[PDB]
């Protein structure tokens with residue numbers, strides 16, 4: 001009863017799933033788990049003049065995201081990563097912009113935007129040739145090691161690791177540069193997942209295409225291994241204008257595959273693959289920071 005990832009992706013898409021509550025112009029950079037049978041979603045927020053973060057009140061159906069409470073975090077967790085860390089029975093929210101290049105907080109109740117612990121350092125390193133520095137971290141463990149992957153708005157993807165026994169903890173300053181391409185080809189929004197029922201991991205990376213933001217996919221047999229391009233061009237993307245089935249947006253941008261198992265392995269089921277993404281009206285212009293990003297969900301077609 002196991003499925004494989006396809007070599008060519010075709011999706012259907014929802015429309016816009018929610019409008020930002022009064023005071024925000026955008027909801028962004030989603031991370032999501034299923035928690036007690038309900039979708040639990042964190043994301044960045046923007047007023048146009050500053051970035052923050054929020055959690056949606058848990059909801060069973062994506063069609064009900066529009067009515068879900070939108071709960072601001074009192075301390076911003078921009079571009080967050082949410083997961084349950086089973087070896088220490090603790091939830092983790094990792095993010096950027098704070099006292100360190102990457103930061104994390106922990107909790108016993110991930111539904112509370114303000115129940116998170118004091119911030120701790122996740123990563124303290126620096127990268128060359130980047131206007132942003134380290135951006136858009138994700139975390140993923142196999143059975144042995146916890147990995148940090150991140151981007152730099154600069155065509156590179158970076159990786160760090162520690163024994164899982166040492167997590168939650170600080171990766172420190174060291175990293176490996178694992179991919180190098182043009183800025184457009186490997187820009188930001190990197191995510192890594194375990195493919196359930198396959199000896200395979202999936203990496204997606206947001207690229208800047210001629211027609212809008214899209215995702216390029218890569219596979220590996222191991223988290224410390226080499227990545228092989230899978231659906232890695234604008235014409236044959238993991239997800240983009242070419243194959244999203246979305247009419248409301250020409251951009252498929254920073255989000256999260258839907259993770260039914262909330263744990264640190266970031267496992268996705270290739271039999272029922274779905275993608276919570278940010279998109280925007282093709283008509284929306286102005287400064288990047290004020291763009292009206294909105295949540296949508298792609299469902300992989302049989």
Ligand SMILES: OC[C@@H]1O[C@H](O)[C@H](O)[C@H]1O
Nearest residue numbers: 028044079136188189254
């Ligand atoms: O939303 C803040 C930054 O903008 C981009 O969406 C990037 O992915 C994120 O780190």
Ligand SMILES: [Ca+2]
Nearest residue numbers: 079080136137
């Ligand atoms: Ca992310």
Ligand SMILES: [Cl-]
Nearest residue numbers: 159160161176
């Ligand atoms: Cl490493």
